[PDB]
Design a protein around this ligand. Structure first.
Ligand SMILES: Nc1ncnc2c1ncn2[C@@H]1O[C@H](COP(=O)(O)OP(=O)(O)O)[C@@H](O)[C@H]1O
Ligand SMILES: Nc1ncnc2c1ncn2[C@@H]1O[C@H](COP(=O)(O)OP(=O)(O)O)[C@@H](O)[C@H]1O
Ligand SMILES: Nc1ncnc2c1ncn2[C@@H]1O[C@H](COP(=O)(O)OP(=O)(O)O)[C@@H](O)[C@H]1O
Ligand SMILES: Nc1ncnc2c1ncn2[C@@H]1O[C@H](COP(=O)(O)OP(=O)(O)O)[C@@H](O)[C@H]1O
Ligand SMILES: Nc1ncnc2c1ncn2[C@@H]1O[C@H](COP(=O)(O)OP(=O)(O)O)[C@@H](O)[C@H]1O
Ligand code: ALF
Ligand code: ALF
Ligand code: ALF
Ligand code: ALF
Ligand code: ALF
Ligand SMILES: [Mg+2]
Ligand SMILES: [Mg+2]
Ligand SMILES: [Mg+2]
Ligand SMILES: [Mg+2]
Ligand SMILES: [Mg+2]
Length: 1603
DNA sequence: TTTTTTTTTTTTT
DNA sequence: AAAAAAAAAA
């Protein structure tokens, strides 16, 4: 075995043998721009230095001779061939092997070894592994010839990805398995880092692994540096290896060899070995001896005979000049074209993009990809080159292209139908040799044939990528031999499941990465402002791959909208930087002559002096370029016209034509129904045949605006379709907006794929002109609905969208059909820069949309008292049609639409077309109104004059103006509808006007004034509703009232008590049918929601309510610990639930109400600091949103008997929003309905009020509201009569064998549920025993009375708070004592670290059996509880001071604890008391969570001292019941805490006895049954102490009297 | 043998 | 201001 140096010393050591083996086969593979070519050339250089003959096979068609020479290759003697077929390439090798003249042969990319049949054939249908079988044959033939010739052969290979291999690594190597086996050495090279120079990237840090070794031990690895333009930093390696072997001394930063100091820092040491080649050889030799795991151990005149013989053979076989010496091959020299950016041309090193090569540009949407491309076309045409554009993205605007300076009339252009078509076109135009530069707009948009022909959902695993990989092989060869440049524009996609690196990729697999000679990364970095205006995009491009010069240089510049790249701008800056232009502050001078004042003018001057500009540019290029470059055309047009004939008789009548004459390319627009928006769009409206996205917050105007454009389009007679995936569109309101309901096609689809497939049908039909999809948010994938809630479908939704886009773009343009997607806003979490807002359904839509709108409600349109509309602002966020970032404001008047004439007045006054004399409005001298109100109304009345003003405004303000047959349309229309319905169900799509299931039905809320405030008269069936508010506000109560109401009409209800707090007895008191109310206390949140989904689908339940979304704890959270952070897991769960439920709730006509709690958002100073648990999903999907608040107390002299209540309608999809209702909740009774009725009746003048007297129709019915209410109670007949008239008078949107089948599907659902979520997860409330309320004595009798129930509730949460030393701990211990006396097990959590055992015992606690913990962290404390709860062994747990619950890291912690504990505490019947401190200006530590979840809340206070003449022996104490979910709240108890004894029981007994008249109090004397028992409370207490018998007797009577 | 494709979401005085 | 865990396609 003999070896050759690789040019890397460390690699030679890693090889064991000291180099690569002669007469053997070697493979090198790795990622793109890793070093494969470079390394190869270094070994050639090395071999030539010893005088060996080399050959290079540049199948990749990418080798740069000049760079090869820079690496130290003898160009003039390096044999080189760019073969046409793969067989040719290999046959050449076999000849050169057999010749025995060549010593080393390298083949650049087996990847590029395209079989003959593959080029000869098409692009599209393949021949899988007619390339692997070819390789396998080549190997067999070559092995023998290579050994007997002692000739080394190196194959360079690229990396591809084996799909979904979850066992080893997903990487392979092109050309099958043949090469793996035959190779004696296999190398894996990778770029691991950058070799930096402060600012500059001057090289690639490199690592090679020996992956196969037949010559020595395998799996050794070598690292080194590739210095761009120099090669492998050999001396660098040598320094390091030398120091490592102790041959070179390193004294800190000083390097010594044999006592002589040779450098300071690796930099100089390297340079020294460079200067002493003699000493360098000496060190290298010793290193090789020290580290090589094996030693190696008249004539050439015959070689040249057989050499020349082989070359003659080859050329008379494969063409005139198939193989020649690299140094003389002219077609190998690199030529460049300007990019239209000067700084980019400098960054490229070569001065521009390389001819006959492949280039990729990628970046975010609206970054400059298309624009930049067109600038290079413009540039190339200016020098007279022929260009072609492939608008696969179907989005190129001819007018804008011309504004950028492109010759439209001569720019060849094609909008292809399939991806294969697009690429086949290229291959024709390449081979033609007529075209010089071709650009393909979006490889993203290169949809494979099978994908368009298939459905949406049809999965084509890496079909797209495999197509690209084939295209590359075929094109490389044809592009070089034609000297034709090809630029691919690409989009960015996110790769999911990557935590290192960057999460960005590029569509169309890995093929393009490798074949591209240049790869550009363009990004918009800032806005080019004009005080107010945004006139351009600040832009930065990174050279990410470079086969032509050094990579990783970057260029910045400006794209001025409507003009292009600011070239002269660059030139000024570059000139000043190089000292060619003088800058004296704000003055710019060139060669003494002053040329401008400020960059603005200097630029304009260079514009005016093109001659001087060229002169400066040239000098800059000379000063700053890293690699300076350097009868006939009548034949071109022959082969051109020949290619075009070929193409059109292959891909259709007019598949390719000159851009300037293609009519279907011009842009047409439709009014949005907002004038100012039309101006902001520049073009005057939305573009036909394109895609548009509108997004914004909930109830912002997305649906409404959409309908207005439909209305507008129908007014001109266009056919529209609406896809109500959100399942929320109200036909009546749509009509009020002016939509033709009867002719508006409409579909509520079941799956997302269905929705999109429908579009694709309606697009292709060419019958529909405008289609709108309501909420991409609501486009739920098939698998998601078919799966459960919790089933994770990682970016399945987004991948679906991305496929939809590809298919739709083509069909929408060729049909001239507009498509608008409405989208919702979600928050992205873990972003601190930028804005935290996104858009559902991934990145696909961002790119494909031609217009992107951001709509927001900015204010209320008021009417003194009334809110009659939403002040609205829309921002143009993306614009492919005109300049972006203009914004429009206007009014949406509820029930009317966009105030168009409003806009018109304002715009008219602003342009001085309408005169405004204070409050008076004049047009052409004629006064038309007084105040905007009337002026608007006047333009309404004079539509003729209105058109006249509008037209002038449009002329004045539009930056981009535009100005037998239908019987065939209805054929293809009806054809599409038949298709659809026989595919997606009986009535999946129909005319809105006849769809009955679309009409709106309502249910009473149990509050009359709320029903009026709703406009519709109640809550909407088959929709989602949210009620939120502060704690004890009325949320649960109100809910139950609607259930009661619905049951009274015989509807089936279900309740989901996730809050675990519903009291059956109170529910019954409110008038609910307990025995028939289905009820579930679920364990996880997913369980709760899955239950709903079952009950929805069942169609048996009519109304479902979920108590606290706050309490919908995700599975993982319960299964995890307290402290385990689940970032927005809860919210993501909700968002999934919404998608699944909307569809099932409408088709079942089932109402769903979510009760929600209020949390505070922290770090907000504007607005209100209040939110709602469970993210943003529910905001959007809810058709009604209610805000309920307790505003006052309903008093009874002394007693508090109810809560004065106010509800605000905060969202309304059913009627006008923002009306509010007030009423009374009477504790234990419910909403005072008749109360409302009296007030409403008096207000409408139906009931007469003469001071305190109430009369109806002359008959006096009461004295004061009290009696009047009671009278209507007694006359239900007359009450109905008054209510009906009130409803007629005040409802703004007036309303709209069989049940035996229901119980079949009901029972079926319940069986399903219980065999899924446990033995008794759902049952009738009336029979659920675990739901009944049990109590424990507090140790204070008066407190037990004040509680109403007689004590604290088991299996619930309780909070006690108060000032310091008020009695919190003490009282707690008394209840423990009490509970232990009945034999319950207690636990105490002394987080306050202050509990005194001896005092606890004095209070009567069983110390020996009281479980007790002093925890270290707060999470620990709560986790302990959760364990003790779940154990079901402990009955009562108390936590001393939530104040003292210090988080580990040291409210969000509390909020998580609540969710987890509620469920575990009820199912264990375990009481939990939290003691809290005080921080009216009073609060409670640990946020708002506990307020809501507590069933009882106590306020204890020391009010006085219990004196003993001199001594203070106790604290006089008062407790207020502040919250009560168990009985009526706000009762208060007083008593005595005697220090060292406890709650002075006998004290209480004396007071209670005197109060009930059982004990006589004659001043200071206390008598019982005539017998005097004490003098002053002191002695009376002591007497009852002494007569325990009589004490029991009194207590018993008090209990009978007061319980 | 031949090949990738894609995000999803708040949480709290 | 400091937190992360998810996969199914010829
Ligand atoms: N002509 C050149 N001038 C300067 N640097 C180059 C040139 N060609 C390649 N390089 C650099 O050398 C490194 C490896 O290039 P190369 O060996 O072509 O990668 P591969 O062959 O693995 O695709 C890359 O960082 C690349 O930018
Ligand atoms: N027809 C037009 N008129 C004015 N500005 C435009 C037009 N088309 C695009 N632009 C602007 O040029 C910039 C880049 O657009 P483009 O080159 O189409 O990006 P990409 O192809 O990368 O999505 C954006 O700021 C965009 O708003
Ligand atoms: N049926 C209706 N009656 C009265 N006003 C409505 C109705 N539907 C919607 N609105 C009002 O129109 C505005 C926007 O509603 P919409 O277009 O549905 O918003 P989005 O679809 O963006 O959530 C809101 O202010 C809302 O109150
Ligand atoms: N079982 C009951 N007996 C008497 N009053 C009750 C009962 N349950 C609740 N209340 C009272 O009804 C009002 C609202 O209670 P609820 O609807 O549970 O509030 P929320 O669910 O909004 O926290 C409060 O004043 C509360 O004290
Ligand atoms: N170990 C003890 N011995 C005597 N008196 C005590 C003891 N602990 C508390 N007290 C008294 O009882 C009253 C209330 O105590 P405690 O219930 O601990 O108050 P809080 O828990 O509200 O701070 C105070 O006046 C206090 O001085
Ligand atoms: F790629 Al674009 F607007 F042309 F996102
Ligand atoms: F030489 Al390459 F991708 F194979 F840059
Ligand atoms: F998307 Al909406 F109200 F229609 F939030
Ligand atoms: F003494 Al304390 F809460 F203030 F127990
Ligand atoms: F029912 Al609550 F706070 F949500 F009392
Ligand atoms: Mg290479
Ligand atoms: Mg583009
Ligand atoms: Mg909507
Ligand atoms: Mg509640
Ligand atoms: Mg205490």
């Amino acid at each position: 075995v003999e070896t050759i140096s690789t040019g890397s010393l460390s690699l030679d050591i890693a090889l064991g043998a000291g180099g690569l083996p002669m007469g053997r086969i070697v493979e090198i593979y790795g990622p793109e721009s890793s070093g494969k070519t470079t390394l190869t050339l270094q070994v050639i250089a090395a071999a030539q230095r010893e005088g060996k003959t080399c050959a290079f096979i540049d199948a990749e068609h990418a080798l740069d001779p000049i760079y090869a020479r820079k690496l130290g290759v003898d160009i003039d003697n390096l044999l080189c061939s760019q073969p046409d077929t793969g067989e040719q390439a290999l046959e050449i090798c076999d000849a050169l092997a057999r010749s025995g003249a060549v010593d080393v042969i390298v083949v650049d990319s087996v990847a590029a070894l395209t079989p003959k049949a593959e080029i000869e054939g098409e692009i599209g249908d393949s021949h899988m592994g007619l390339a692997a079988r070819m390789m396998s044959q080549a190997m067999r033939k070559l092995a023998g010839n290579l050994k007997q010739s002692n000739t080394l052969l190196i194959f360079i290979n690229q990396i591809r990805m084996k799909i979904g291999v979850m066992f080893g690594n997903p990487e392979t190597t092109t050309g099958g398995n043949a090469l793996k086996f035959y190779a004696s050495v296999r190398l894996d090279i990778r770029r691991i880092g950058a070799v930096k120079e402060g600012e500059n990237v001057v090289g690639s840090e490199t690592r090679v692994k020996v992956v196969k070794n037949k010559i020595a031990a395998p799996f050794k690895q070598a690292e080194f540096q590739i210095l761009y333009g120099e090669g492998i930093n050999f001396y660098g390696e040598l320094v390091d290896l030398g120091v490592k072997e102790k041959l070179i001394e390193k004294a800190g930063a000083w390097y010594s060899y044999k006592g002589e100091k040779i450098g300071q820092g690796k930099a100089n040491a390297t340079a020294w070995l460079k200067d002493n080649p003699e000493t360098a050889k000496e060190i290298e030799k010793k290193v090789r001896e020290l580290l090589l795991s094996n030693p190696n151990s008249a004539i050439d005149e015959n070689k040249q005979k057989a050499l020349a013989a082989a070359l003659g053979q080859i050329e008379k076989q494969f063409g005139k000049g198939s193989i020649m010496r690299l140094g003389e091959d002219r077609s190998m020299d690199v030529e460049t074209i300007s990019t239209g950016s000067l700084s980019l041309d400098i960054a490229l090193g070569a001065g521009g993009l390389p001819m006959g090569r492949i280039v990729e540009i990628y970046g975010p949407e609206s970054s400059g990809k298309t624009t930049l491309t067109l600038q290079v076309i413009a540039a190339a045409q200016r020098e007279g080159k022929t260009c072609a554009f492939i608008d696969a993205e179907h989005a190129l605007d001819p007018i804008y292209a011309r504004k950028l300076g492109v010759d439209i009339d001569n720019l060849l252009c094609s909008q292809p139908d399939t991806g294969e078509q697009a690429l086949e076109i290229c291959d024709a135009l390449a081979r033609s040799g007529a075209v010089d530069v071709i650009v393909v707009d979006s490889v993203a948009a290169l949809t494979p044939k099978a994908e368009i022909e298939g459905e949406i959902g049809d999965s084509h695993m890496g079909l797209a990528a495999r197509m690209m990989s084939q295209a590359m092989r075929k094109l490389a060869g044809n592009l070089k031999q034609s000297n034709t440049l090809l630029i691919f524009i690409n989009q960015i996609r996110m790769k999911i499941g990557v935590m290192f690196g960057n999460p960005e990729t590029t569509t169309g697999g890995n093929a393009l990465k490798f074949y591209a000679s240049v790869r550009l990364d363009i990004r918009r970095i800032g806005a080019v402002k004009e005080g107010e205006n945004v006139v351009g995009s600040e832009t930065r491009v990174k050279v990410v791959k470079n086969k032509i010069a050094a990579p990783f240089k970057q260029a910045e510049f400006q794209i001025l909208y409507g003009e292009g790249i600011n070239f002269y701008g660059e030139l000024v800056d570059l000139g000043v930087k190089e000292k060619l232009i003088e800058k004296a502050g704000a003055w710019y001078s060139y060669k003494g002559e002053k040329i401008g004042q400020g960059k603005a003018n200097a630029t304009a001057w260079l514009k005016d002096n093109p001659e001087t500009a060229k002169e400066i540019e040239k000098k800059v290029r000379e000063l700053l370029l890293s690699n300076p470059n350097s009868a006939i055309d009548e034949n071109k047009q022959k082969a051109l016209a020949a290619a075009l004939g070929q193409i059109e008789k292959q891909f259709g009548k007019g598949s390719i034509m000159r851009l300037g004459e293609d009519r279907s390319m011009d842009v047409e627009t439709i009014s949005t129904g907002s004038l100012s928006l039309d101006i902001a769009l520049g073009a005057g409206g939305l573009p036909m045949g394109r895609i548009v996205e509108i997004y914004g917050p909930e109830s912002s105007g997305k649906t409404t605006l959409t309908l207005q454009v439909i209305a507008a389009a129908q007014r001109e007679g266009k056919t529209c379709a609406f896809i109500d995936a959100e399942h929320a569109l109200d036909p009546i309101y749509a009509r009020k907006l002016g939509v033709d309901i009867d002719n508006l096609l409409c579909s509520q689809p079941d799956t997302g794929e269905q929705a999109l497939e429908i579009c694709d049908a309606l697009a292709r039909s060419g019958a529909v002109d405008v289609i709108v999809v309501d909420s991409v948010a609501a486009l739920t994938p098939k698998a998601e609905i078919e799966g459960e809630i919790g089933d994770s479908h990682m970016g399945l939704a987004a991948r679906m969208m991305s496929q939809a886009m590809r298919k739709l773009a083509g069909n929408l343009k060729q049909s001239n059909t507009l498509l608008i997607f409405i989208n919702q806003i979600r928050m992205k979490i873990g972003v601190m820069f930028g804005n935290p807002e996104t858009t559902t359904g991934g990145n696909a839509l961002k790119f494909y949309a031609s217009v992107r709108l951001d709509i927001r409600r900015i204010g209320a349109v008021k009417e003194g008292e009334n809110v009659v509309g939403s002040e609205t602002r829309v921002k143009v966020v993306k614009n492919k049609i005109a300049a972006p970032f203009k914004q429009a404001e206007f009014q949406i008047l509820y029930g009317e639409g966009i105030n168009f004439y409003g806009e018109l007045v304002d715009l008219g006054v602003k342009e001085k077309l309408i005169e405004k004399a204070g409050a008076w409005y004049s047009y052409k001298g004629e006064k038309i109104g007084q105040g905007k109100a009337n002026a608007t109304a006047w333009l309404k009345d004079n539509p003729e004059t209105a058109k006249e003003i509008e037209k002038k405004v449009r002329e004045l303000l539009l930056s981009n103006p535009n100005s037998a047959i239908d019987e065939n349309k209805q054929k293809a229309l009806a054809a599409a509808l038949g298709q659809i319905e026989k595919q997606f169900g009986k009535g999946s799509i129909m005319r809105l006007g006849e769809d009955r299931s679309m009409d709106v039905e309502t249910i009473s809320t149990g509050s009359l004034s709320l029903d009026i405030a709703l406009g519709a008269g109640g809550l909407p069936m088959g929709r989602i509703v949210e009620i939120y508010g502060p704690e004890s506000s009325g949320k649960t109560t109100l809910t139950l009232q609607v259930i009661a109401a619905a049951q009274r009409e015989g509807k089936t209800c279900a309740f989901i008590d996730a809050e675990h707090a519903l009291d059956p007895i109170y529910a019954r008191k409110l008038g609910v049918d307990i025995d028939n109310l289905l009820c579930s206390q679920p364990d996880t949140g997913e369980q709760a929601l899955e239950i709903c989904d079952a009950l929805a689908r069942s169609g048996a339940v009519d109304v479902i309510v979920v108590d606290s979304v706050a309490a919908l704890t995700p599975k993982a959270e319960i299964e995890g610990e307290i402290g385990d952070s689940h970032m927005g897991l809860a919210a993501r769960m909700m968002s999934q639930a919404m998608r699944k439920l909307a569809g099932n709730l409408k088709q079942s006509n089932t109402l769903l109400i979510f009760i929600n709690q209020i949390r505070m958002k922290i770090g907000v100073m504007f607005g209100n600091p209040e939110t709602t648990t469970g993210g943003n999903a529910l905001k959007f999907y809810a058709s009604v949103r209610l805000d309920i608040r307790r505003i006052g107390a309903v008093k009874e002299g002394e007693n508090v008997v109810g809560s004065e209540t106010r509800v605000k309608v905060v969202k309304n999809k059913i009627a006008a929003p923002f009306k509010q209702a007030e009423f009374q909740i009477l504790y234990g009774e419910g909403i005072n309905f008749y109360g409302e009725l009296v007030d409403l009746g008096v207000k409408e003048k139906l009931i007469e009020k003469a001071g305190a007297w109430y009369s109806y129709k002359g008959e006096k019915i009461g004295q004061g509201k009290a009696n009047a209410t009671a009278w209507l109670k007694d006359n239900p007949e007359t009450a109905k009569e008054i209510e009906k008239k009130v409803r007629e008078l005040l409802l703004s949107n007036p309303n709209s064998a069989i049940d035996e089948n229901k119980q079949k599907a009901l029972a079926a659902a319940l069986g399903q549920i219980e065999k899924q979520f446990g033995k008794g997860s759902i049952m009738r409330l009336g029979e659920d025993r675990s739901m009944d309320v049990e109590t424990i004595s507090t140790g204070s009798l008066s407190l037990d009375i004040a509680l109403g129930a007689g004590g604290l509730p088991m299996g619930r949460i309780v909070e006690i708070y108060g000032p310091e030393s008020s009695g919190k701990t003490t009282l707690t211990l008394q209840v423990i004592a009490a509970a232990q006396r009945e034999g319950k097990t207690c636990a105490f959590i002394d987080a306050e670290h202050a509990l005194d055992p001896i005092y606890a015992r004095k209070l009567g606690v069983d110390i020996d059996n009281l479980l007790c913990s002093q925890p270290d962290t707060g999470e620990q404390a709560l986790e302990i509880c959760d364990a003790l709860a779940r154990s079901g062994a402990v009955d009562v747990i108390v936590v001393d001071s939530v104040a003292a619950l210090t988080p580990k890291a040291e409210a969000r912690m509390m909020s998580q604890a609540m969710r987890k504990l509620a469920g575990n505490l009820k199912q264990s019947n375990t009481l939990l008391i939290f003691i809290n401190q005080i921080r009216n200006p009073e609060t409670t530590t640990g946020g708002n969570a506990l307020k809501f979840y507590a069933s009882v809340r106590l306020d204890i206070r020391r009010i006085g001292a219990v004196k003993e003449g001199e001594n203070v022996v106790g604290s006089e104490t008062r407790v207020k019941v502040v919250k009560n979910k168990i009985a009526a709240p706000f009762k208060q108890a007083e008593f005595q805490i005697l220090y060292g004894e406890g709650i002075n029981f006998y004290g209480e007994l004396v007071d209670l006895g005197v109060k009930e008249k059982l004990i006589e109090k004659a001043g200071a004397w206390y008598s019982y049954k005539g017998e005097k028992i004490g003098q002053g409370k002191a002695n009376a207490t002591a007497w009852l102490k002494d007569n325990p018998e009589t004490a029991k007797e009194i207590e018993k009577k008090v209990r009978e009297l007061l319980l």
